[PDB]
Amino acid sequence: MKSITFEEHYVIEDIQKETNADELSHHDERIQFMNNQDVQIQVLSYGNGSPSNLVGQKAIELCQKANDQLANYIAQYPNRFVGFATLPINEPEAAAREFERCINDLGFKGALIMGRAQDGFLDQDKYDIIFKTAENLDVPIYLHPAPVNSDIYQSYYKGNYPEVTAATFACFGYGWHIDVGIHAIHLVLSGIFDRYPKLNMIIGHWGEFIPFFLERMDEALFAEHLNHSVSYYFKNSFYITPSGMLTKPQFDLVKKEVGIDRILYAADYPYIEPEKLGVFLDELGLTDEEKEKISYTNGAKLLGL
Ligand SMILES: [Ca+2]
Numbered sequence: 592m593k594s595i596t597f598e599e600h601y602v603i604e605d606i607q608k609e610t611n612a613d614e615l616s617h618h619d620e621r622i623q624f625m626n627n628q629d630v631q632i633q634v635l636s637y638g639n640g641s642p643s644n645l646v647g648q649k650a651i652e653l654c655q656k657a658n659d660q661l662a663n664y665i666a667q668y669p670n671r672f673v674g675f676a677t678l679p680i681n682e683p684e685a686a687a688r689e690f691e692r693c694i695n696d697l698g699f700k701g702a703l704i705m706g707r708a709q710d711g712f713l714d715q716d717k718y719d720i721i722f723k724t725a726e727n728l729d730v731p732i733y734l735h736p737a738p739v740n741s742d743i744y745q746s747y748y749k750g751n752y753p754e755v756t757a758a759t760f761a762c763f764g765y766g767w768h769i770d771v772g773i774h775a776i777h778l779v780l781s782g783i784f785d786r787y788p789k790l791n792m793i794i795g796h797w798g799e800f801i802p803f804f805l806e807r808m809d810e811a812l813f814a815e816h817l818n819h820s821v822s823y824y825f826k827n828s829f830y831i832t833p834s835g836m837l838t839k840p841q842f843d844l845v846k847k848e849v850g851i852d853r854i855l856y857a858a859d860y861p862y863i864e865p866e867k868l869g870v871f872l873d874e875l876g877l878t879d880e881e882k883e884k885i886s887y888t889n890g891a892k893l894l895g896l
């Protein structure tokens with residue numbers, strides 16, 4: 592059974608010099624992984640050091656270059672890849688125009704945004720245009736982690752242990768996942784999904800802790816200004832992926848909280864190269880219908896394939 596994978600990364604060497612298997616030129620290594628793991632399509636997004644974290648004209652020009660080079664690559668292998676836009680978030684009106692260009696000119700099927708803006712989370716009024724654009728284009732936004740701000744690193748992650756421990760704790764060990772979950776909650780609480788009810792967002796790492804507390808948020812997080820309960824937005828406007836963390840207890844929690852229709856597959860290639868990607872869905876006690884949904888059908892519907 593073939594899959595569509597949603598959190599698969601690339602970088603461009605020349606863009607990296609300005610800002611190894613992640614390099615877009617490493618085509619054969621990418622295809623070997625996909626073929627061996629029964630992956631039909633990788634949805635490609637910029638990886639480490641994305642130009643989306645830069646400011647002004649430089650951020651604009653480097654995102655345009657990344658998107659153009661990605662589109663040239665997909666045009667060579669159109670049956671195996673779909674593109675997600677890289678946006679200069681620190682320039683929101685320019686980001687919304689680049690989003691439109693990616694969808695309408697480049698044939699991309701959404702955007703992946705790493706971290707947050709230089710001035711905070713994307714619930715701020717100035718970023719509303721990005722979400723409005725995504726709904727208008729009928730495409731999702733994948734909200735991905737990135738390094739936390741220095742004030743969070745110093746308050747929460749530095750402690751009585753080595754610096755390498757503090758850095759990994761702040762990043763992929765825990766911290767940047769806590770951060771992206773909080774960012775996604777800001778988006779819900781700000782009413783983005785009441786303004787743009789057809790908008791869908793995607794989050795990785797089994798929901799960035801959010802599914803652990805859905806029932807508790809409905810009971811304890813006061814949000815009477817929204818049209819729906821807090822949990823409703825995660826069940827109806829979000830999709831969740833594993834990001835190559837192929838662990839059953841988290842899958843079971845996510846299935847009970849959001850349901851099978853909201854789960855998409857993802858490997859986090861090449862930062863994770865999960866050897867069990869092609870067999871994991873067979874170890875969860877799922878029906879063939881459920882396996883088909885997670886592997887390809889939920890994603891094919893979302894991407895309009
Ligand atoms: Ca990733």
